[PDB]
Amino acid sequence: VPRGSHMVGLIWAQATSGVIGRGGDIPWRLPEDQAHFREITMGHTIVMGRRTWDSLPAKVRPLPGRRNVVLSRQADFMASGAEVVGSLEEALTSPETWVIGGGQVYALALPYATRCEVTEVDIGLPREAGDALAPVLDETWRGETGEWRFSRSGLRYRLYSYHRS
Ligand SMILES: NC(=O)c1ccc[n+]([C@@H]2O[C@H](COP(=O)([O-])OP(=O)(O)OC[C@H]3O[C@@H](n4cnc5c(N)ncnc54)[C@H](OP(=O)(O)O)[C@@H]3O)[C@@H](O)[C@H]2O)c1
Numbered sequence: 001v002p003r004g005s006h007m008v009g010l011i012w013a014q015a016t017s018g019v020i021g022r023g024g025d026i027p028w029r030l031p032e033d034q035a036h037f038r039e040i041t042m043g044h045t046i047v048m049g050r051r052t053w054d055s056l057p058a059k060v061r062p063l064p065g066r067r068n069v070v071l072s073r074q075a076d077f078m079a080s081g082a083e084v085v086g087s088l089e090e091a092l093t094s095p096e097t098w099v100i101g102g103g104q105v106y107a108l109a110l111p112y113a114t115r116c117e118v119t120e121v122d123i124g125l126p127r128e129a130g131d132a133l134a135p136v137l138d139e140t141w142r143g144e145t146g147e148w149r150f151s152r153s154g155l156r157y158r159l160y161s162y163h164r165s
C-alpha cells in the first residue's frame with residue numbers, strides 16, 4: 001500500500017435496530033468496544049459533531065493520542081483541546097480520518113468514506129423519537145463479519161470491518 005492517500009473512515013456501535021444514541025448518551029456500556037474504538041482511531045484525526053463532543057465527560061476530552069475535530073455551526077464554540085470547523089470541507093484533510101459520530105455527522109461524511117468499522121450490539125432497543133441512528137449501508141460496502149462474542153457484562157456483540165473503492 002503506497003503512501004499518500006486520504007482515507008476517510010466511519011466508526012460506530014449500534015443496536016440491532018440501528019440505534020446509536022439516546023438521551024445524549026450511548027444506551028449501553030461495552031468496555032470491549034471502547035478498547036476497539038481506541039485501537040482503530042489511535043494516532044489519527046477524529047471528527048465528531050458538537051453533540052458527540054458534549055456527550056464526552058470533560059475529564060476525558062480531548063480523546064488522547066488523536067487530533068480532535070468538532071463540527072459546529074457556532075463559530076464561538078469552546079472545545080478545549082480540539083479544533084472547531086463549520087463544515088466537513090476542511091475536516092477531511094488528514095492522511096487518515098475517522099468520523100466518530102454522531103448520527104448527523106455520519107450522514108454528512110458517508111459519501112467520502114471508504115471504510116466503516118461497526119460494532120453490532122445484540123440489544124433490542126426499538127427506535128424512539130429523538131434517537132441518533134446509524135447510517136444505512138448500501139451494497140457497495142464489503143468486508144468481514146466477526147463472530148459473536150460475550151462481553152464481560154454478558155452483552156453479546158460482533159465486529160464488522162467494511163470497505164469499498
Ligand atoms: N454508538 C456510537 O457509536 C456513538 C458514537 C458517537 C455518538 N453517539 C451518540 O449519538 C448522539 C449524538 O448524535 P447526534 O446526531 O445527536 O449529533 P452529532 O452528529 O454528534 O452532532 C450534531 C451537531 O453537529 C453540528 N452539525 C451537524 N450538521 C452540521 C453541518 N452540516 N454543518 C456544521 N455543523 C453541523 C451541529 O452543531 P451545533 O448545534 O453546535 O451547530 C449539530 O447540532 C449522542 O447520543 C451520542 O451519545 C453514539
Ligand SMILES: CCOC(=O)CCc1ccccc1OCCCOc1c(N)nc(N)nc1CC
Binds near residue numbers: 100
Ligand atoms: C472509557 C471511556 O472512554 C470515553 O469516554 C471514550 C469512549 C466512550 C465511552 C463511553 C461512551 C462514549 C464514548 O465515546 C463516544 C465517542 C465514540 O463513540 C464510539 C464510536 N464512534 N464507535 C464505537 N465503536 N464505539 C464508540 C464508543 C466507545
